[PDB]
Ligand binder design. Sequence first.
Ligand SMILES: CC(=O)N[C@@H]1[C@@H](O)[C@H](O)[C@@H](CO)O[C@H]1O
Ligand SMILES: [Ca+2]
Length: 220
Amino acid sequence: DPTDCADILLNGYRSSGGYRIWPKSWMTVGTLNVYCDMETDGGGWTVIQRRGNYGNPSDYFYKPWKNYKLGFGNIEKDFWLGNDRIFALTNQRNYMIRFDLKDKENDTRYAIYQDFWIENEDYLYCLHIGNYSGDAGNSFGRHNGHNFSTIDKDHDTHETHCAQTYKGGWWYDRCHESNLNGLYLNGEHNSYADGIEWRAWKGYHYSLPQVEMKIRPVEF
Ligand SMILES: CC(=O)N[C@@H]1[C@@H](O)[C@H](O)[C@@H](CO)O[C@H]1O
Ligand SMILES: [Ca+2]
C-alpha cells in the first residue's frame, strides 16, 4: 500500500529505519526495502544515497553501469539505491530532493531542489531538477539536463572521460561542481576534486565525511 516513506509516515510509523514499500511500478522493479529518515524537517524522506565511514574501501563507489543501474550497498550504511529504482520512485509523482552534508568538524549544510526526477535507461537516466534553496551553495544545479556516466560509459559533454578522472557514477558535465559518489578521502586532500565534493561549500580539495541524498513529495 505505501508507495514511499512519506506514505509510511502518514500510516503512523515515526521511527527511522528500513521499511518495505510498494512503488506504483512494483510490477517491474518489485517491492523494495528503503531507508526512511523520519527525523529531518518532519520526516517522510526516502533515502536514495549515503556515504559514511562504515568500513568499505575508499573506492567502493567506483563501479560500472550495471552496478549503478541495479544499486549496491546496505541501506543502513553506505549505498546507492539504483537508477532503475530511482527512476521508478521519482516518476510516480512529483518529488523534491534534499542533500544533507556534514564536514569533519560536525558542521552541516543542506540543499533542496524541487521537481527532481531522472528519465529511464534508454535516455541514459538524464537528470531533471528545479529551483534551489538552502545554505550549502548551489553545486548540483549545473548538472541539470545531463546523462549519467560511469567508468565504463562516457556520456558527458567533455573531451575526456569525467567518470574515470573523478571516480564516480554521476550526471557529469565538464565535469562537476558536486561529486558525492566520488572517492571517500575523508577530509582535505591534495588530489584534484576526486573525493566527495560540494564545491560551493568546501571547494575541490575536501571530501565530506558524511552525506545523504533523500526525496520527499513536493505536496508533503
Ligand atoms: C572538477 C571539475 O569539473 N573542474 C572543472 C575544470 O576542470 C574546468 O576547466 C572548469 C571550467 O570552468 O570548471 C570546473 O568546474
Ligand atoms: Ca567525455
